[PDB]
Amino acid sequence: KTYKIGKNAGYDGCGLCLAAISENEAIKVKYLRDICPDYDGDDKAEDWLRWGTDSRVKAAALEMEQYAYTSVGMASCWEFVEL
Amino acid sequence: KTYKIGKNAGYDGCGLCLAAISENEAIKVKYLRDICPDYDGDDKAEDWLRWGTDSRVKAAALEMEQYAYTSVGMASCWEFVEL
């Protein structure tokens, strides 16, 4: 599933990210490379097997989930794809 | 075919663009949205059917072609893909 990333959502190019989704749009994104500065992968979906249970990723997701449906995925050309 | 975009090549994120290619690298990119400010598409490959014969696009391409192999394509995630 694919969702447009708005212009005030924190977009910063391609990368694995969390997204908050509301009314068919990703209204906030948070990149794995910012949540976890020690992340050194090449943005492969399989990287979430390693990083998805990181306490920093869990904390970032819980903060967004208070307010909107949240999921792990990948950002590319202003679109968020759910993984 | 896909080429890494160089660091001083004019990269500005995602979008339809012309690229000059040298030694398996895109050493200059010029975005359609900058060449033609009236372009208002969603960076679909088919958009080049409308815009590829615009006189501003032909002029930008010929300028680069003087010095390097040039093609129309799409820039995303620091790579250029030929169309």
Residue numbers in the entry:
A (entry chain B), B (entry chain A): 3 to 85
Q: What wording appears in the published article?
A:
In the dimeric structure, one of the protomers is rotated roughly 180 degrees relative to the other partner, which then allows for the dimerization via two intermolecular disulfide bonds. The subunit orientation of the dimer is restricted to a great extent by the two intermolecular disulfide bonds, shown in Fig. 3c, d. Each subunit of the dimeric form aligns with the reduced monomeric form of NmeAcrIIC1 with a small RMSD of 0.68 and 0.73 Å, respectively. Second, by examining the electron density map of the oxidized NmeAcrIIC1, we observed that both of the intermolecular disulfide bonds are not fully occupied, indicative of dynamic short-lived chemical groups. Second, the estimated rotational correlation time (Τc) for the oxidized dimer is almost twice as that for the reduced monomer (11.6 versus 6.0 ns), whereas the trends of 15N backbone relaxation data of R1, R2, and Het-NOE align well between the two states on a residue-by-residue base, which reveals a rigid dimer with restricted orientation for each subunit but lacking large interfacial surface that is supposed to alter the dynamic properties of the residues involved. Importantly, compared with the structure of NmeAcrIIC1’s complex with NmeHNH, the counterpart subunit of dimeric NmeAcrIIC1 occupies the position of the NmeHNH, burying the “hot spot” residue Ser79, thereby inhibiting the interaction between NmeAcrIIC1 with NmeHNH through steric hindrance.
Anti-CRISPRs (Acrs) are natural inhibitors of bacteria’s CRISPR-Cas systems, and have been developed as a safeguard to reduce the off-target effects of CRISPR gene-editing technology. Structural studies show that AcrIIC1 can directly bind to the conserved HNH nuclease domain of Cas9 to abolish its DNA cleavage activity. In this work, we report the discovery of a redox switch for NmeAcrIIC1, which regulates NmeAcrIIC1’s monomer-dimer interconversion and inhibitory activity on Cas9.
